[PDB]
Amino acid sequence: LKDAQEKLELAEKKATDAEADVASLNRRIQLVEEELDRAQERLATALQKLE
Amino acid sequence: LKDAQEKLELAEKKATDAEADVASLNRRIQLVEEELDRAQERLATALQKLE
Amino acid sequence: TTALVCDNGSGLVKAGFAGDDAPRAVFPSIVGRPRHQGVMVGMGQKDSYVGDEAQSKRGILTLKYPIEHGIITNWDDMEKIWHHTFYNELRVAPEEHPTLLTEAPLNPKANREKMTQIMFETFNVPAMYVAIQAVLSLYASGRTTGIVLDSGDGVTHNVPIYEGYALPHAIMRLDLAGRDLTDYLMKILTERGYSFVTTAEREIVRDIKEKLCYVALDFENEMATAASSSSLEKSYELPDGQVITIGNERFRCPETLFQPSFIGMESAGIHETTYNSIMKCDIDIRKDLYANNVLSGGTTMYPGIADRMQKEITALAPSTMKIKIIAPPERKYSVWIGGSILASLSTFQQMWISKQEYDEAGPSIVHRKCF
Amino acid sequence: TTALVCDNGSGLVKAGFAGDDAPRAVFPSIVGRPRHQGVMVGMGQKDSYVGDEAQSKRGILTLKYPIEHGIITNWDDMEKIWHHTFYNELRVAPEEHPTLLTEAPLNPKANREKMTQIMFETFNVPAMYVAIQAVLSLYASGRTTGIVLDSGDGVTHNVPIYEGYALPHAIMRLDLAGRDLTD
Ligand SMILES: Nc1ncnc2c1ncn2[C@@H]1O[C@H](COP(=O)(O)OP(=O)(O)O)[C@@H](O)[C@H]1O
Ligand SMILES: Nc1ncnc2c1ncn2[C@@H]1O[C@H](COP(=O)(O)OP(=O)(O)O)[C@@H](O)[C@H]1O
Ligand SMILES: [Mg+2]
Ligand SMILES: [Mg+2]
Question: Which of chain A's termini has less CB crowding within 10 Å, N or C?
């Protein structure tokens, strides 16, 4: 039980940590993709202007 | 508990898999940051050529 | 005071106080009377186990969902489910809390009117408001445009929205959902020898579907691969032993979403009803809808669906538009998170259907300005 | 002070301070109310988007020009357009600036009188003057004679002028213009 207790607590902490990491990284990837797309639209504007 | 033991092990494995995706999302974040910087630079040069 | 954001759904009732991140109590919506005789005296045997209690005694019960396809077919059982949700899973009397139910689009009026009449007469809430299940899922994504495909367990509906102005003529509601996929999986498992018939074993087949099935990126290649190698056969242990091995049933069960001809339905898959829903919109907001396609609901949690759907739409759509599919990790509770956000708004605080208003106009108040 | 040279036109409102080379703000003259229902709460949805804002949300609006053929058919919308032009595209209160509107030849009197009444009562300008749209186009060419064919978007009119003396009996106004070509 005590062994099971420690196993359970450690696994739960590890799981919550991984979840928080992946969620925040998902937010980051969203932000960087927004950067990319908005920059692409700037690229299109510039292309039209130059042509 | 034996089933709680298997559950905690599976949840910690799920945490580790989420961490592997954390690594992959980190790679996406870094490469997209390179893309963002390159887009800033290319947009600057395009606007200059427009001038 | 705080508002109660209940969300009836069909398959899982999700509830909790407004302003949090996740529903407080999530439990299946099944009410199962016992079916055998019962010989022990004084065991304290009740006449109907509802909610998560009937998923533990399901061996001697006959579980029956009170909500078939969005609509409610058995009002007494639904009242029992609501009573359980309020009193035992949240332990807050409804006399002191506004409620925010959710309803699928294009549902019968009588269902909504009966829902409001129950909430005002039996539970006697101060004020209740009914909202369309897709607008909330759009709230949760933090967007204000986009076309949301909310493939629940009862019914799959696809509501496009632009700049906050919903397009009522472009809602495409299809009745294929998770329950039909469970039935089809239970029907194709018989090709290996495993027969599940009892209404209790439908839960076991549902667990198999949740844990093993996945959506194939390309269907024919997967069918060819699973027929030559054996790298796909994943095994699963029943509630009593006798492990089973699922072969190419893994990606054939959720493939029904993209080819509803498998279960005999005529209509087109969820990959083509989204494109049709977009094409009914005006010609100037199609780019934004293409770029902000939102997924929600439980059934959209299959591993590998956000790529298959994007590939299909990219095949259908013009080559220039960018197709992006928003698939947040908190897909299952997206509707409820959006409901919490909407109930927490100050601007929304005067849209509730106050009880005195119901007393003056009857249950038909819901179709009126207070929508 | 400086004068405001507004030019209502029909299709593009062109405005700017007197003495420059190009108009400061050029934007279509359309006022479009939303037509669908709207489900998001608190989105800050207005009741009428005018000018260049309604050329970006045109997917859910019903744009309607307030000027049909030179004449103005919907005075409330035209007042809204003028208010937008003064306050948001130029950001100069009209209480401190003369205005110089422009009007097609051979237009109904009531249109011109209502225009001046609006400019003097609602916006309360110090002084306004209405000029024929062809004499200005002759000014810009630096000539003093010549017959100018000013084929706008609402109405095409052809005013001949010699030595500064306009010939009122030779103005030929025809109502075919850019809008009919679009249709
Ligand atoms: N992780 C999962 N993988 C695959 N399918 C799932 C998963 N979770 C839930 N489902 C399916 O989704 C259904 C639950 O959908 P849900 O969003 O709760 O419906 P509702 O809109 O009524 O709340 C279940 O019946 C199940 O079949
Ligand atoms: N580059 C162009 N080529 C062809 N037609 C044009 C061009 N620019 C504008 N137009 C037409 O002219 C109209 C604008 O005319 P304009 O001179 O602004 O009218 P107004 O006299 O009311 O200002 C537009 O509706 C368009 O149809
Ligand atoms: Mg739902
Ligand atoms: Mg003109």
Answer: C
Same structural domain, C125 and C28: yes
Chains A, C: CB contacts under 8 A, how many? 5
Residues C207 and C116 in one domain: no
C80, containing H or E segment: helix C75-84
Cα–Cα distance, D106 to D87 (Å, whole number)? 31
**Domain CATH code at residue C249:** 3.90.640.10
Instruction: Report the residue of chain C nearest D58, measured CA to CA.
Output: C284
Q: Specify the number of domains making up chain D.
A: 1
Quote the domain boundaries for residue C203: 178-256
Residue nearest to atom 8 of ligand 1 (CA): C298
- State which ligand 2 atom lies nearest to the alpha carbon of D10: 22
Establish if C169 touches chain A: CB-CB under 8 angstroms. Answer: no
Q: Are residues C30 and C85 in the same domain?
A: yes
Give the domain CATH number at D42: 3.30.420.40
Reading the block at residue A9, the tokens are 């607590």
- Per the listing, tokens 């800050």 go with D44
Name the DSSP class of D11: S
Alpha-carbon distance D165 to B26, whole Å?
Answer: 77
Q: Ligand 2 center to residue D152 CA distance, Å?
A: 6
Helix (H) / strand (E) containing D129: strand D128-132
| Dist. CA C133–CA C135, nearest whole Å | 6
Whole-number Å distance between alpha carbons of C321 and C279: 13
* Subunit contact A22:B18, Cβ cutoff 8 A: yes
The answer to whether residue D150 sits within a structural domain is no
What is the C-alpha R_g of chain A?
22
Q: Whose CA is nearest to atom 18 of ligand 2?
A: D12
Q: Is C36 in the A-facing interface, judged by CB distances under 8 Å? A: no
Asked whether residue D104 is assigned to any structural domain, the reply reads yes
Residues in the ligand 2 pocket, defined by CB under 6 Å: D 9-12, 152-154, 178, 182
Resolution in Å, one decimal, please: 5.7
Same-domain check for residues C245 and C193:
yes
Torsions phi, psi for A24 (to 5 deg): -65, -40
Same domain, C86 and C201: no
| Alpha carbons D168 and D159: distance in angstroms, whole number | 8
* Residue D149 CB contacts under 8 Å (≥ 6 apart), including other chains: D156, D158
